[PDB]
Structure 1
């Protein structure tokens, strides 16, 4: 019965209350659930970024934070490392947060979200269909792998 994380997850608290983009829900971690192939993102301790269906993996607990305006700093709790994109397309994590760790979160009207790379706005973060990280060069429009659905771990 406990098959899951903690506290009933099926729920939609705060239906709105005027407030969705500004700070107001970045106090608790958020599970990044990808709609393409239904896969959750998970930063391995080795920095290798991948994805797994096990929604119980206590490693999927990524600590996200808001910064400036529209930008968001991602951080790993167990991995204790900040996500960072490379120049060729290899995605990995590190202990120090460099300017190559931000991601513009463009929320669309489909309740979904798209994390675009900053140092390289010519690509977006998207996984494949086996939990592998799609190269930053093979990523682009057309693929729905950019539709993310971060669920806040409130209740």
Structure 2
């Protein structure tokens, strides 16, 4: 129930997921907390993406091995093991950016998103058209 415009680029190397909204890099902390930071020297912003199926990815911390995941109430968290809450539909947006929709809650359009203050957005609060959901994958 979603378009299938996919972004270029591959998953060969790790990446930083830069959010245009506030200019924060998606960060996965050791305690499982998820947020954003502007500090490019941070050791928890290096992410390795992998495709489980065409257009479906896992997003993992290279530093801690944790998987980005969105829970039943729309909150992002770091998971120690891969589960259905760790799969995201990676799509092109505005002919330029990358967006990540929770596969588990795809029917409700719950996106991975960062606010201007660097805090994560809760699933139900995200939607097409926001800058919070637009990411650019940059080399590490």
Normalised TM-score (structure 2)? 0.87
How do residues 31-46 of structure 1 correspond to structure 2 at under 5 angstroms?
A: 31-46=16-31
2:105 matched to 1:138? no
Paired residues of 1:25 and 1:152 also in contact (CA < 8 A): no
Paired residues of 2:22 and 2:114 also in contact (CA < 8 A): no
Q: 2:35 aligns with which of 34, 50, 57?
A: 50
How do residues 2-41 of structure 1 correspond to structure 2 at under 5 angstroms?
A: 21=8, 25-41=10-26
Return the offset for 1:82. 0.8
More strand by share: 2
Corresponding position of 2:4:
none
Normalised TM-score (structure 1)? 0.79
Q: List gaps (5 residues or longer) in structure 2.
A: 1-6
Change (3 A) 1:133 1:109: closer
Paired residues of 2:35 and 2:118 also in contact (CA < 8 A): yes
Aligned CA RMSD, in angstroms, stands at 1.5
How many corresponding residue pairs?
132
Return the offset for 1:110. 2.7
Measured in 2, the distance between the counterparts of 1:91 and 1:116 equals 12
Q: List gaps (5 residues or longer) in structure 1.
A: 1-19
